[model samples]
Target chain A: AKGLVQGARTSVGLAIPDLTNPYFPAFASSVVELATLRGWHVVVDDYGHGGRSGLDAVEHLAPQVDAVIGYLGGYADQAQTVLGRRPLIVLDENPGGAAGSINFDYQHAAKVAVAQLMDSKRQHIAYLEAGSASESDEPVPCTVRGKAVAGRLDELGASWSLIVAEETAEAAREAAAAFLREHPETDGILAFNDLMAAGVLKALSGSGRRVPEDCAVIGMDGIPLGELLSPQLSTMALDLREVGRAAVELLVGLLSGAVTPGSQSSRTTLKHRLVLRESTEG
Target chain B: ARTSVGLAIPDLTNPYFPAFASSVVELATLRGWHVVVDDYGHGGRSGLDAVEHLAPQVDAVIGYLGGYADQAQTVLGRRPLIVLDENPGGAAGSINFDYQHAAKVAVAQLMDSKRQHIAYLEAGSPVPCTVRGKAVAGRLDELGASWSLIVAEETAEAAREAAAAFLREHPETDGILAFNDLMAAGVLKALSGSGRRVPEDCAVIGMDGIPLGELLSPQLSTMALDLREVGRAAVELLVGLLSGAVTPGSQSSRTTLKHRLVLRESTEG
Candidate 1:
């Protein structure tokens, strides 16, 4: 009876990492649609992404809205303190100080991707990681994706390597080119995301290596762009809308006292499934 | 005084639109104006209806109108209205991107690459796209380079299938000019699937220098439009209108965004 009470108007502050990145927009658009449906006013603040700190954006937004939801990036520690007492919902990366968090299980996704490459019977594999993993205790998506692949490959006793780059397709392409040049034996690549996978595929194409034939490439996030690649990228697609809806639903529950915030903060993990395409098959 | 602006966009799913919207929001933020974006495309509350609802809340309105230009003045009364992409019947000013020039440049690039026969891949029927299409056809005809048209829906998957079919039917088609980066991506995908060599076998070029283009294997060579500048120019024009320094109601105030051709592996390879 408490969720979204009859006449009350809920105000939500949506802090997106970067609207330029296709991923965040896909995520943000969904949140905007559902929030509007529930008669909520959503104020979106684009605080870039990993490079620039969004603590200021959240701090400015915290006092004005009933709740603030966004990707806290590496500044989760500073964000929690700055956004004191305000119900904050974290997306993608968990910064620890959120009332509720909705995340894609990157570890499981990486495992699935690694298994797919192994199924292709590829001996040497390379992992393309986006951004440098932090030394802090909190788990980062890039690190999780890379670590899971490395761990799984170790379990299989297969040889694998890691290459870190900025969270951009272009950066991943450059990194992949260098990695491939250094290790010509590498026949499989697991990119940080579909965007990076597109870059990896391109690097392979440039190096005269055919996908799935010369090398098998698998991307993490299932974005539409992946499907557009020459060898449609094989990726772990997350239900973006479900992730968005979950955040709004959880936020509403907390606001209405229908669901109390646990002493430590609760997480709702969205399962990611493998989308096989020409990248892995051909 | 805290000023607010109502920004209406057709769709947020399209990267181009979001890039444009983000530019407007960035400029508006610097000016201390709160921007309330309303998506009037799919899954939206309504198209013009969303704009109507936002009229009472903001001092001015700006957005891309998809053929609903005539009703803009009536719906957004007293609010300074600026239309983008489409030159509606009523508005203070219109910002028309020179996509036609960019398309002409793309054709020249293909021709320069020694590609004799080329094909054009397009999605949807946006006015700007139509203008670019006509310009491309006109330029190709003038150059005497044989060409064909393949139209598909706005999705990359559909474009990929259509391009594959078209390529199989016409193996002589040695080059392609896609309407946008997304469609161009589809053409690349199809080309790769068919085992056709890029540049050496067929040259491809896309409009809009989307960041995704650089990540393509034979990286997408595209006509780069400064979208950030387009956004900044629009806000500047709107600011002038809001200040009573510029007049509306006529096509006197017009901004034409220029584009540049970026050479990449798609055509050079």
Candidate 2:
């Protein structure tokens, strides 16, 4: 009864990854704002610390709140089990046993981005995914978005490479600089997110390669930082507010028993629009 | 009461506010107090509207309520109201930041580094010189240093445009301090765009040590605040007021926090 409010009110738990990434904060802020307007309370957990995962966040949150939403890095099954009957709205991946889910059309996103690079005549394209989380250099499995982009390039039979690094700008800069030393002819670089794209930009510039002319760079997640970088980042952008709204609205249905858990009505998929900016100019 | 606490922040899009807000939410949740966040930066809502929106359900409130502490307190009546960077006016308690102290240290850093013709990038017009702007300008005046003023929208993009124009007009401006880390980023971009190197041709500094600072090319040095501590003090004050350990408008009800200088490549290089 920790969150058993005095009136007909409810509390929700919001689990987000590192707020430092900017994307998560934007998504969380949208969730918090709309959730407030609807007269609901939010308990936020930045479970991006202390080697925490979605399951860890859900367990901490389950005791205090009625429902939860998160970008749960594939721990959806475990998290749902932890919550038991409470609704879980998972973002960016499969819902597993969770009550409701929101997913992105990354396969379509890959087609759009790859086509853009092809249209701009980028011959030696490279995909910069945010992780070398594995040590085996032969190519360990990557993110769904990464797999989609990788698969599309293979389907197209294009000349390409993959670069992985820690999910940070400085980390990307270092990884990219090393990649440039190995493959100096890389003409197009697509990053996992805007922050990593920023790091790639720095590496390209440091290597004396002009943006767009020497290398066309594209990033996923149309973060505001895309506009702030030196050669403004071109991106595969989603309406982040709508992403959260979709999740929150779905949760409301699940909580009110209007939408059954794990039913077709509880699933929502969104797409990313291609935003052409300076970084992707021909 | 639902033991709900409303947070009225003007903008959540800004990196600084979210860092401050999430800290408050984490701490508030631990005590089983619900956090109702009002991000009224859009839809033409004022700080007063935010409080008015949340006033009905929540037992207490905390926010950077623009400059409406008095009206917000009036709306909430006897509820514990905490406002940040604004005067208490008629609020139960206030959390103030020492901008003058920040300004003094900022000026000394620039002066000690032998920077002349320093520019303080204010977050554009509508409001005349802010406490931060005045404190910085006053320090520069006392130093008799050759300094200038540049203004822009709070975002890095607008700051970049404004800083770019200023540089085109007066290329001699060698030191740049910004409204916040975002504007500081814009200034760095402008200096680089104009073929001037950061800290070499023109040093750049920012307020608010957001994580983005470390990501920049030459990492940004800033006037850093412990946002977590700020949130803690605000909540602990709520704890005291709600429990009657502290009176509503007594000496114990108000607290002031200061920002410390965090040096990085932006200043040192």
Candidate 3:
């Protein structure tokens, strides 16, 4: 009759795609902070492995860890098989319709980016989406966000175009500069993330376009780095701390048998709020 | 013998700590030692707790100590402890970067760019950076350059808020010496938002040349330290003590690394 919280697992595992990306750090830090508070130690394994190979890396990690939480790239669907019997908490995109997930409303977030551009009375908006893989031409969430943005633009009867390039900031900058060159009339840019938006800002600055005056720019994933850019980036900020906390609580419940896991796996969707700054200021 | 080392860091969210940890791991792996990293910056874990966790399994420990030397000594038992960027009570050795000289070089760079009125953005709880700021002020005084100090929190958000206020209150400031690259980045953003062109209206120099600096339109001009070399030197010092060549708790044995000024777009204008 005693609770099953006794003899609960003490160790958890976190798999991040790359550490150099500032976005993942905030996510990992939130999880680590909360997990540490619950007396659970997190062993972080950075799977530099990209694309399909990243799933193999997760499979390799499954045996070493008690439970797993991570951004499962293209392996979202096969997450349960890859993780074996261990409980899984998927971050960002949901994989295989997994039992437990902490999701962000990217579609709504993209819609917000469009609304900001339309509100500024700016026409000919462009979307810069980053390709997920550096070596391959695979579509990632950045493209999804880009598509969502384009969909909203059509709904609003605004002129728009989409540019997809390698996820690196440099690549995005070059692509943005080229897009602006090809279309001198472009007056607004909605970047997939702050990093990409930083590139767009740099390209526009170098091209002699005044930010928020000649062209307005908006980025997603409101990271601290965004605030450092000129015309300080306007972004869709996610509550990363709450997202991490929710992920850990879900795992704790599953381990304690307080919540049963199966076809009815729990899913939580977090909201993204808009932070206006000089980037989109009129 | 297959020995292990514990590397404790403040926060990985900040790029600096991860770069340091990676360097330590690369060097230790080459020397046949396994490295275990413990991030104690968050709550529920202390420097002493990291020491206690590794004391039984690791032969030596190295990291930025957030706690006093006495507590670390008691928790770490007899393991050789090497402190980085911090001076603690009873550690076996200390490795400090030449921040004073670095600060002098940063100020001189701004001055060379014809910036007369410079501001120093100091961290709220200045530990290792206090010496850097003092050196900057001392150099400014000697050169007859006017300077002001504004304290900022560690995060970029707070730093930007403080820097934005500083800019409004002191419109004459033409140069800035930030505590680190992160704070310097905040200053950059503040200036950008204020419509002040870098190097034209103001020159900025940051410490720790992180990768993100290069991506900025006017790349960050910073004093870059060889963090990997610092990592290698810490391990070498610990290996020496482990081999009985260097005596433990010897105050005479201190390692100092020099920093070089990396001229980039931020100050080039």
* The best candidate in terms of lDDT: 2
What docking grade applies to model 3?
acceptable
lDDT of 2 by residue, A11-65 (tens): 7888876567888878877887788778775656666554667787788778767
> Relative to the unseen true structure, what is the C-alpha lDDT of residue B33 in candidate 2, on a scale of 0 to 100?
64
| Candidate maximizing DockQ | 1
Measured by TM-score, how close is model 3 to the native structure? 0.81
Docking class of 2: incorrect
- Between candidates 1 and 2, the TM-score winner: 1
Q: Give all TM-scores, in the order shown.
A: 0.81, 0.76, 0.81
True contacts preserved, each candidate? 0.38, 0.19, 0.31
Cα lDDT tens digits for candidate 2, B1-269: 23778888887678898788778877876776666566777546688877877787679989898899999999999898998888888889999988889999988888888997789999865233777888888888888999888878888878989999999999889888797898898888888888997787788889987877766767799999888898899999999988999888788999999999999888863
**Candidate 2, B187: how far from true, in Å?**
3.0
Q: Give per-residue lDDT, candidate 2, residue B73.
A: 90
Ranking by lDDT: 2, 3, 1
Ranking by DockQ: 1, 3, 2
